[PDB]
Amino acid sequence: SNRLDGKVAIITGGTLGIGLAIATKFVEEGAKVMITDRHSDVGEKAAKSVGTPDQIQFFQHDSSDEDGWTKLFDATEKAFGPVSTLVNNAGIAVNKSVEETTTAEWRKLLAVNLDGVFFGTRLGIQRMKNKGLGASIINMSSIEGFVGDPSLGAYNASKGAVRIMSKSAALDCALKDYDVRVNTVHPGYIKTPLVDDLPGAEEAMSQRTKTPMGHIGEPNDIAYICVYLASNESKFATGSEFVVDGGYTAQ
Amino acid sequence: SNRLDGKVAIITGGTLGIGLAIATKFVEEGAKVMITDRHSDVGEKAAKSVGTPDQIQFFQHDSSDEDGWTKLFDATEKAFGPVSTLVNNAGIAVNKSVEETTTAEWRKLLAVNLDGVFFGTRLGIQRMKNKGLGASIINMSSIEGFVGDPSLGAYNASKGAVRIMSKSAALDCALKDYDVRVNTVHPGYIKTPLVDDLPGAEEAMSQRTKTPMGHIGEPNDIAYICVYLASNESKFATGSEFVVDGGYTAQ
Amino acid sequence: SNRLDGKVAIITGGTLGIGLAIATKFVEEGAKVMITDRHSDVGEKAAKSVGTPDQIQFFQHDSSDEDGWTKLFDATEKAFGPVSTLVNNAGIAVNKSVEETTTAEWRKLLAVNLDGVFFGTRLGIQRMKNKGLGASIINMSSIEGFVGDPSLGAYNASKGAVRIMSKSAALDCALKDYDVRVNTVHPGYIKTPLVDDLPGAEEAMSQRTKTPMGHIGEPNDIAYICVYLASNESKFATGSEFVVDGGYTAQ
Amino acid sequence: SNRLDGKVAIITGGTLGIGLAIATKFVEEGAKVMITDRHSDVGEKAAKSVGTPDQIQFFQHDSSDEDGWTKLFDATEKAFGPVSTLVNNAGIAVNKSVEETTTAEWRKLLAVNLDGVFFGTRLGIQRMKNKGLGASIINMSSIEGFVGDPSLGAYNASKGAVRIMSKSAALDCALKDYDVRVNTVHPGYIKTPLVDDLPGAEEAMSQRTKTPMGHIGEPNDIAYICVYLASNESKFATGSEFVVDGGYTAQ
Ligand SMILES: [Mg+2]
Ligand SMILES: [Mg+2]
């Protein structure tokens, strides 16, 4: 209870699935939250579903949009005061091997999953440093930041990039006494409405050769590790990877 | 608040430092706790310092003592009901390179840091499986489960062993639907009375070439990640390493 | 001797330092080699310094140039027959933290270090698969694919990306029986003329807190691991990272 | 050719499978070799099958036998001159989960796979340091030093231990300018007569969910990476893990 007292969080891709659960638990624990999505039609509904405007609001933004990042931080600060917490959660996937990835697919995926995370991390450091906020940047990787998948080539590239970029940022922030921590979270497979819409997907993900627990996770599994990382409870954790994957990478 | 509702935890080496902080936060979050130490004279004091006998008790036990493990589980169950949570935290160190480690030092360290963790893990699985407890075994490694230290040869061996043994156990428990998770926690350097008694130690540990944050942690840093891992919040986390090290292993 | 009998290799950035040593040892071991560089003025000199045109030639190419990749493979095949071996070695660095990286710096570095490696890997798979060549793609990471450096933010992103992308490609090639292996090589610090031109650099790199051996490597250190990976000696190695770093990442 | 000119190597468990292939290629590359096994009846045959007594000899030794280690080094030095190279390859397996491992099984496996490797590493450092030999200690892990197997609990413990202990030793040797390198080799599944005798084993190991290449390796796959690590070609490689696993750990 009140584990995020006084925190102000931006969560990209916060209107659905993992991002929405993070937003929900953040609000429950006392944080003010701005959620984003590229779209407008889902965001206001999603915010109101979690709480009132004094707790959580929506801001339309594509995380690949560099200039939109300043606007997002400015809107969040206007609503709630200085931002203390950034969850870079927006991402997309291309279901292609490296061999079969078009250059357009490559650039599109990297724009969201890599450039977007860089834009957010860079701006977050600049805006959150040296303010006594207990600032925390949580960058969403996945199991595909550790292991390959033959049909997620560009996705693997992006997750490996975010995994190690985050360490660079963590180190610089620590060495410069910025009061900003940077860590990555690595979900395995998580059940969402989007997964439910893909016939056979949950079953395939739940095979023991994929997920040893024999079932997949749920959005709150990722929410709870994010609460820990946003909270001052994790004030000595930086530059590290936090894996919640049902055993996927343990075998 | 009440994040460990109904849990019953054993914490080896729970009378000091990290173990004591884990015990303290476990009690605060609603767990019943049995702490151990090889000795008798510190344990009762330490338990009473945290709470009353209905919350926390002491049991004298050397974790290298195989038969004493059954006795410890039996005493905890008698006091509090079936054990749901085991933190294998008892450990020792030998300040020797591999080259300069005597065989007696080798066997002594492995008896506590490796055999003891095996005895606890094996018995914990047997006692906690198939009971709907949301059981969790938390095995204490350190940064020395990831990286070498030229003057901690046997210690490195033990921490590497626990790191990967824990994955084996996690997988078997998951595949067999035992309702037991197994994970490791990897502290960097943590300030304790024992560190305070070693002249120059905290300062050396706090150099940026060691800990990028420029200071060391505190016992509660390790307590909070243990609460998360004991709690049902981490029900999809198994077979993974949770690092809280001020950036030590990020560079 | 003759460890690369019949092999035909492309080495990007093969006119200097590590790339040139790889080229030299490849020729010594019986491979035909095409080396590249963005420039023209160094390449012909460098090739002739290693061997005759029937052994090694130069092709001007910037690895960020997608269309130039087809041209490079076509020129190499014309000179030497079908390409069996690709070493993606071309890379640049920006000496900036994530916080201080401009977007132009970000895109420039990723164009060479990430896009270029993707273009080469994708085309290499397409051109080398299913031909009985014992094909091998060797992607040059560095220690900065494993650990952060606070002043190499974009570089870290690129090396983490290549590390995990390479695993995706390795897996797809293995599962599809393509007869293409993909692995990464991770040099620590290596002495070259460019390092010699930077006052204090080798000394800083040689401090024990950086490189435990107390000195840095030399280009042939990286050449020899590349010979092993190009050779049929490594026919069961794929999807793996080969580190030659004087102990840098071991502590 | 002559890649191990002048080297003198001890290979534990060198009479069969991987160890025998290492011995064979070592002799081919100009090293003198002493192979061991607990038994006498296989060793002399195995040595003669590789070469003459001036190239390779046998010494009966159980690697768990501490005092026998001095005797082994003394016999090798008598035959061939000072030892430059140690391959700790002797190992056993227990096919049990952590839960089902008896204490006797635990101690037996650790005696060979952990104590034996420690005894060899410790003595090797003492005997090989400061002699200008280009000394190299190669410690045999496996994929089970990286990932768990639910039915190889004690084995996982041993391989994780050797993985990180080896880093400690590498660092101490590097920092003290001992001219000794220490690295680990991590085979996936390898076809041997022992595997052939286990019905269904190779087929199970060759499933794509285990080995992405769809087949297992052969002893020479491990021999060739050992040649590289024993050779002065790898003079800047220390404290690192060299994986040859058909993609097993890449997914
Ligand atoms: Mg390090
Ligand atoms: Mg795996």
What letter would DSSP give residue C169? H
Torsion of CA B109, B111, B114, B119, to 10 degrees: -160
DSSP code of C3?
T
Nearest residue to D64 via CA among B114, B66, B106, B65: B106
The span from the CA of B104 to the CA of A63, in Å, is 58
Sign of CA dihedral C38, C14, C172, C178: positive
CA distance C31 to C7: 5
User: What residues contact residue D61 under an 8 Å CB cut-off, 6+ apart?
Assistant: D12, D36, D37, D38, D68, D69, D71, D72
Distance CA C108, CA C97 (A): 15
Q: What is the DSSP string of D188-234?
A: --B--HHHHTSTTHHHHHHSTTT-TTSS-B-HHHHHHHHHHHHSGGG
- The dihedrals phi and psi of A91, each to the nearest 5 degrees, come to -165, 160
Q: Which of C95, C92, C94, C73 is nearest to C82 (CA)?
A: C73
B50-55: long-range pairs with CB below 8 Å, 24+? B50/B20, B50/B23, B50/B24, B51/B27, B53/B79, B55/B27
| Cα C19 → chain centroid | 7
Of D167, D218, D163, the residue nearest D190 (C-alpha):
D218
Half-sphere exposure of B124 (CA within 13 A, CB side): 32
| Residues A147, A153, A155, A157, CA torsion sign | positive
Ligand number, closest to the Cα atom of C144: 1
Q: Which two tokens stand for residue D15?
A: 């009479």
Taking each continuous run of H as one helix and of E as one strand, the counts in chain D are 9, 7
Tokens 């450039």 correspond to A115
The whole-angstrom distance between D98's CA and the closest CA on chain A is 15
CA distance D35 to D21: 11
* Distance of alpha carbon A34 from alpha carbon A49, whole angstroms: 13
Structure tokens that stand for C158 in this block: 């690129």
Q: Is D66 helix (H, G, I), strand (E, B) or coil?
A: helix
**Separation of CA D248 and ligand 2 centre (Å):** 7
CA D4 to the chain's CA centroid: 17
Tokens of B62: 């050397």
> Among B96, B208, B188, which residue's Cα sits nearest to residue B144?
B188
In 3-state terms, what secondary structure has residue A74? helix
* Burial of residue A2, with CB atoms counted within 10 A of its CB: 0-12 exposed, 13-18 middle, 19 or more buried: exposed
Quickly count: other Cβ atoms within 10 Å of residue B37's Cβ.
Answer: 23
- Method used to solve the structure: X-ray
| Angstrom distance (rounded) from CA B47 to CA C67 | 71
- Does residue B2 sit in helix, strand or coil? coil
Query: Does residue A250 belong to the interface with chain B, where contact is any CB pair within 8 Å?
Result: yes
Q: Which ligand is nearest to the CA of A148?
A: 2
- Chain A residues 31-50 with CB within 8 Å of chain D: none
Measured between alpha carbons, how far is C148 from A4 in angstroms, rounded to an integer?
28
- Rounded (10°) angle between helices C219-230 and D219-230: 170
**Structure token digits, residue B60:** 């004298």
CB atoms < 10 A from the CB of A193, how many?
A: 8
Residue A122 near residue A174 (C-beta atoms within 8 A): no
User: Position A233: which residue type?
Assistant: E
Q: Cα separations (Å) of B64 from A106, A155, B91, B107, B113?
A: 54, 46, 10, 11, 8
Joined together, the tokens standing for residue C187 give: 């040099």
CA distance D217 to D195: 11
Q: Is some CB atom of chain D closer than 8 A to the CB atom of C214?
A: yes
Q: Which of A147, A148, A250 lies at the smallest CB-CB distance from D148?
A: A250
Rounded Cα distance, D96 and D84, in Å: 37
Q: For chain A, how far is it from start to end, CA to CA, in angstroms?
A: 35
Distances (CA, A) of D171 to B159, B216, B249, C207, D238: 17, 23, 15, 13, 8
Q: Kindly state whether A158 is in contact with chain C, defined as any CB-CB distance less than 8 angstroms.
A: yes
User: Under CATH, what is the fold of the domain D1-251?
Assistant: Rossmann fold (3.40.50)
Chain D residues inside the 8 Å CB shell of A209: 209
Tell which residue, A28, A226, A34, A46, has the closest CA to residue A139: A226
Grouping H, G, I as helix, E, B as strand and the rest as coil, residue B230 is helix
Closest chain A residue by Cα to residue B251:
A171
Which residue, among C147, B244, C110, has the nearest Cα to A118 in the 3D structure?
C110
Cβ atoms B109, B92 nearer than 8 A: yes
Q: Search chain A and give the residue with CA nearest C154.
A: A165
Contact yes or no for A251 and D209 at CB 8 A: no
For residue C202, report the phi and psi dihedrals to the nearest 5 degrees. Answer: -60, -40
Resolution in angstroms comes to 1.5
Known catalytic residue at C178: no
CA gap D251, D247 in Å, rounded? 7
What CA–CA distances, in Å, run from D11 to A189, C159, D56, D230? 44, 36, 11, 11
Q: Count CB neighbours of C49 within 10 A.
A: 12
Q: Where are the alpha helices (DSSP H) in B103-147?
A: 103-110, 116-128
CA nearest to B144, candidates B222, B16, B245: B245
Residues making up the annotated binding site of C for NADP(+) are 15-16, 18-19, 38-39, 62-63, 89, 91, 155, 159, 190, 192
Do residue B217 and residue A236 have CB atoms under 8 angstroms apart? Answer: yes
Strand order in the sheet with D241-244: D56-60, D32-37, D8-11, D85-88, D135-140, D180-187, D241-244
CA distance B153 to B101: 7
Strands A8-11 and A180-187: unpaired
- Residue D231 CA: distances (Å) to CA of C66, D6, D68, D86: 39, 10, 27, 12
Q: Around Cβ C169, how many Cβ atoms within 10 Å? A: 32
Which letter, b or e, does each residue of D141-159 get, where b requires 16 or more Cβ atoms within 10 Å of its Cβ? Answer: bbbbbbbbbbbbbbbbbbb
Is D240–C245 a contact, with Cβ atoms under 8 angstroms apart? Answer: yes
What does chain C come to in residues? 251
- Quote the ligand 2 centre to D210 CA distance (angstroms): 9
Token pair for residue A92? Answer: 């997309």
- Determine the 3-state secondary structure of C117 from DSSP: helix
Torsion angle in degrees (nearest 10) through CA of D42, D44, D45, D46: 80
Reference D181, options D222, D223, D224, D242; nearest CA is D242
Identify which of C167, C244, C247 has the shortest CB distance to residue D171.
Answer: C247
For residues A76-104, one letter each, b for 16 or more C-beta atoms within 10 angstroms of the residue's C-beta and e for the rest, the string is: beebbeebbbbbbbbbbbbebbbbebeee
Ligand 2 geometric centre to CA of D156 (Å): 15
How many CB atoms lie under 10 A from the CB of residue A202?
Answer: 16
Q: Which residues of A touch B238 (CB under 8 A)?
A: 212-213, 246-247, 250
Nearest Cα neighbor of A145 from A131, A128, A158 is A158
Q: Which residues contact A24 (CB under 8 A, 6 or more apart)?
A: A50, A223
Quick one: which H or E segment has residue C193?
A: helix C193-196
The token pair that represents B76 in the structure block: 């905890």
The letter for the amino acid at D28 is E
CA-based Rg of chain A, rounded to a whole angstrom? 17
Token pair of B153, please?
């040869």
List, in order, residues 6 or more apart from D36 with CB less than 8 Å away: D10, D11, D12, D13, D14, D15, D43, D58, D59, D60, D61, D63, D72, D90
Q: D244 has which bridge partners? A: D187
Supply the DSSP string of A173-221, one letter for each residue: HHHTT-SEEEEEEEE--B--HHHHTSTTHHHHHHSTTT-TTSS-B-HHH
